[model samples]
Target: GSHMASMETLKSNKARLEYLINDMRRERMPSSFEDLWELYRGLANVRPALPVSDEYLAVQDAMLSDLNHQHVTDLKDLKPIKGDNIFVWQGDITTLKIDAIVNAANSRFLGCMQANHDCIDNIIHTKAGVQVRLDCAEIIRQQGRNEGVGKAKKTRGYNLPAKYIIHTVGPQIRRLPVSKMNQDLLAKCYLSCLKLADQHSLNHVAFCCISTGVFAFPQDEAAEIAVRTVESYLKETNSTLKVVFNVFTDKDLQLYKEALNR
Candidate 1:
């Protein structure tokens, strides 16, 4: 009876996961929180003694492959900065298997809750699993306040490829007139993540363009600040940290390439 119950549980778990994925595909939005938990628990419950079925494994692979197709991009022909480990890649930061990836999170730091949002915060949290949200909640609870702009916190990657997720809040600007305050805060966002990675003994970190996108930060200016801040930090400490400037859009990618070259 115990063995039969275990098999039923496995089947039920896989069905829930598959249903969520299918619902997202059809509705073009995130499923419910309960669906998310069922999928997470399903993967977490698997053990050597009760290995996942081949059918479920294939479904898992197919879902990941589809998700990758939506975000992954070509990194070929990218060049690194001379005398520095700074590299550029046009792709999804979540797909990278590095020491850590920086998330351009909001002040709340819990992640974007809006379904199907295009922000990095949403993508990272959705792919990393519900545990990421719970971890951030705990961190903020301990800190006794919402995360501040230019500040950062680290959490386990859970289902993400990278081992760590470094969440940082970027300053939000209103319009084209970028202020020195915004620029300084944006630089701090990068510095804070790098500093946290160093404290954690992480040698490789990827940074997303902070303060850009909905934040109204000029892409070119944001790119320049990101490169300058990281380069300056690497030079000052004589650090061997490998920094990747991960960009999704062509405009940002081109801007980063220019910034790194200079």
Candidate 2:
């Protein structure tokens, strides 16, 4: 009976997700939860989709809770500085419950559609739910074009634990000789998110290292800029906001630690 009950739960969740996919008309219904997640990831930001039911959300939460358990980091594990407002945490940003989490987004701001891109942009959008895409679409339509580099935008977090999502485009470094202008642009990414958060009166925000992966911004340099920029902003404004430098890799975690210490 227990085995049958488990299967029944899976079937119910799968059917609900299939209905969601069909209603969105982005892809064919998937065979299993894993396949459904893949389809959801690829098509989530392509077009508007209906809001998922509470039951469907519960299923998603259960699955994500399991995944998050392995990846989540306790705040106590993040070494705290004596006088600084910035903290560092190494884990999945989606699992964080804060006022906002910054997305290292592209200029499009619609989100990456590439399947399993491993970019923070894709991961954040995937976990935030389809409402994020619709909100972005409306924001872009009002602006009449994609957002420019070094700019930030705010949107509802939807199903995400955070209250808001802060999207910013960082400088994409392709070749050698990372220019001063590029460094300045990267700094602006941090500043942009902070500014938006301040405007919205959000007291807490988490930042993912921007432009360090496929965009190829040197990790150490980017980390330095992030710390310096955020530190300067907090000091200049005398704001009460707290920032978390959310990192996934040991290298980034170390870089952030050193930067914060300085």
Candidate 3:
């Protein structure tokens, strides 16, 4: 009864922000909706994985889905790599409307659990609502151990634009002198996601620069391996699966460009 006032019916963005802020607020209060939004982001940024009631989830999902729709990039709008089914696009991987998007996950696959974390795992989890974390957790629970590097698991996209999220734990590299083992594993990451996607009959899959982020895999090497792996996979399998190389930075875009052109 107490949650009936606003939780029962979310009318406006402002109303939803205020309600969420109130629910997750700390010592200080917000002065404006923008400030309140920062609080919401911070809360979700730091908050541990959890769930809620239908009403709460509906509001949360609506709020998150609205944010997702704000940055939708349709498949038609993107240019394919060399006019092939492969694409090397520059943008947020999460915003792509495809059959699946990749999350460069850590070993646990529970998503980055730290606050102020800038990994794609955290950003994807935050914008994707809290449900994906639970999905990943459930997956790990069933496996009875950490996700092996260069392997992938698919889960519902939750509130994301994509229909599914293919999470793969990329190899974590420290610096140059990348061992043959890690290099091979990085290539396997891309290959693994494609194999998993193929098994699910997914047509389109967008992959972020796996291992190049916090995983510390060298960007140039990772991009080259990614393109090589995907290109080889397509040629061998003759599958018309659309693979998208989603890059968030200029460096990665150029890297994909060079690799794609090779």
Candidate 4:
């Protein structure tokens, strides 16, 4: 509630600033450079227009500009790559050169077959081709549950071309306060995938937003978990694993930028 109130205050301040700017423009108000600077300073807290540290901001801009933009393509489509340090175009995970790509799968271990509320899972299974069903069926038969943690098995991406699919189940829909156990489990899903990549000596990996779809994990919470998991993983491992947070939506990307750009 406090956060919401803060946001509302910020919005009101922004509107007032916009109105002032428009009025000044219409009136063609001429002022000295010092006066203009004073006006800018007055609005600083309402909406910061200057970087807290120009040097740090400059570095951040350069680093972000250099990031592999090819990872998150147009919002409508995203393709998996076949090699480390380069981006390629292909719908299937089998084409990726990375060690592994996480699949947001159900407990059944079957690649997403029937249409579910989630789109990414459906696309993954479709790109992997129908044989994925056979593979998943076998896992389900052996494991005896169709939906929970560690349900999916790592196998060739079938038609997709990735080295392996690290399948992990996410939390189901729930209202706040969300279970801490579920949050811990979601974090574990990421760690489990990274561990699998580590075991295989894979140097690069990409992760889709887990539990943010039909599973109902809040994007902000998920982003925090993701960043924490990767940061902890990198700190502990001597491996040169390059973990990528592959985000599809602008909202998701912004959420990640807020969490990780720290």
Candidate 5:
């Protein structure tokens, strides 16, 4: 719901940006916007799980939407690759203005702690701001222990255009000879996300390709499971939920298209 930047945005954001920069460094701040952004992101990347000031959050939302204007795609702008409820698009998952985007999160669910990591979990948390971890951490605390395979949880997508995030843990395939149990768990990951969305009365959700990266699931098989699971859920419930299979790579673009027989 953030407006694109105006002059006043910078005047407000400038002070918050410098104050945040100074929070972690005595070094001179970079002059270029690109460098400044990279440094700001890198700081957030490594910062441990915690709360953040509303001041920083205000600027974070503005810069995220402003700097990311080129990438932000409205759900209304897309076409479904399958039946009417499903769509496929390739871009940063955080840039979508949908009801929610699925995050393939680890069991700890605090998000990737490494600096400037490219994983979906890290990117979502980084782009959304430190408050994401605050919400995630609280969920973890209330639930106790790590999240299980096929389990899904919801959190507010604070500072994001999306209103919610559905975080799911997909089963990791450590070897090529994946087990049937692993396959079922992976399918449950997709199904669980859909069910959670329904409970919230959300009519739309975008999915990041689950269990396909360092989790080591075979891309071809995983995409098949993702498509089929989502397919059946929408059919079985006669649901109104619209699902977007959000992809970031050209390989996934081809992968998902073929999975949907597009």
Candidate 6:
């Protein structure tokens, strides 16, 4: 793992330092701070120099440990509250009996394999069978547009469970500080989906990590948006809605755990 390389780098640095000090002490050389600096400089070419301060290095080490231990690296692990009734399950999203499930769809809205081998969209389409593609094509044809707008036509799942599938385009990755338009679009995507689910009286919903895989939205930001959006929807609606933050990867699971808290 890359983490192992980092650990080795640190260890090698420490070993070189120790060996230099030991050699100085054995040779009866000046052991004072100034003399130690001179001795260290003599071997500078062998060990090089650390770019960061000791405190910063400590922080870096801690972060590396957390990432390696948890198998995730992001701010999504921070939790502000706890819930006991919530259930986390690992299964295919298509088999769930929940009222609705979110899909990390492309702009086309049609089920097609993208960058990732066996993407969420492809999986859903395959499980739902051929009718799913035909139904999606019909919707695209009816809209006379490339994709659906916010709170637009409610798509009837051909053979998939749940009454309707809320589809929306997510933001593509660019640079840091994602634009206001992108954030608004992503937020609308979440809110509009929930509103549609509520109107249809779906008791449960599952959300894939939107804008995460290929869209370029940072995992931490994506997780925060997801949990906040769902929590807000839960507060607004009086109906009982079971929301599952469907995670497909370990990193995603870590992000969800961080969002949900322990």
Q: For each candidate, what TM-score against the reference?
A: 0.73, 0.81, 0.87, 0.59, 0.86, 0.59
User: Clashing residue pairs in candidate 5, if any?
Assistant: none
lDDT of 5 by residue, 48-161 (tens): 666666766666667665644545789998888888999989987777889988988888888877776767787888777777888888998988887888988999887677
**What is the lDDT of every predicted structure here?**
0.71, 0.75, 0.79, 0.56, 0.80, 0.56
List ranges where model 6 is wrong by over 4 Å: 1-87, 113-116, 148-164, 211-213
The runs of at least 3 residues in candidate 2 whose Cα sits more than 4 Å from the true structure, single-residue gaps closed, are: 1-15, 24-32, 45-79, 82-84, 211-213
Query: Which of the predicted structures, 3 or 4, would earn the higher lDDT when compared with the native?
Result: 3
> Residues 5-33, candidate 2, lDDT per residue (tens digit)?
77876677676567556655633354779
Best by lDDT: 5
Candidate 4 vs. true structure, TM-score: 0.59
Clashing pairs in 3: none
Q: State the local distance difference test value for candidate 4.
A: 0.56
- Model 6, residue 193: C-alpha shift (Å): 1.0
What tens-digit string does per-residue lDDT give for candidate 6 at 43-125?
Answer: 32222122324443343334223322333212122222335223444445665545566765666666653322346665555
Candidate 1 structure lDDT: 0.71
On lDDT, the stronger of 1 and 3 is 3
Worst lDDT window (10 residues) for model 3?
1-10
| Better-scoring candidate (TM-score), 1 or 2 | 2
lDDT of candidate 4 over 126-224, digit per residue (tens):
445344555666677777766567333576555454556777787774776667887888788888887888787776676775434544777778888
Clash pairs, candidate 6, are: 77-258, 173-215
lDDT of 2: 0.75
Over 4 Å off in model 4, which ranges? 1-97, 144-147, 150-152, 211-214
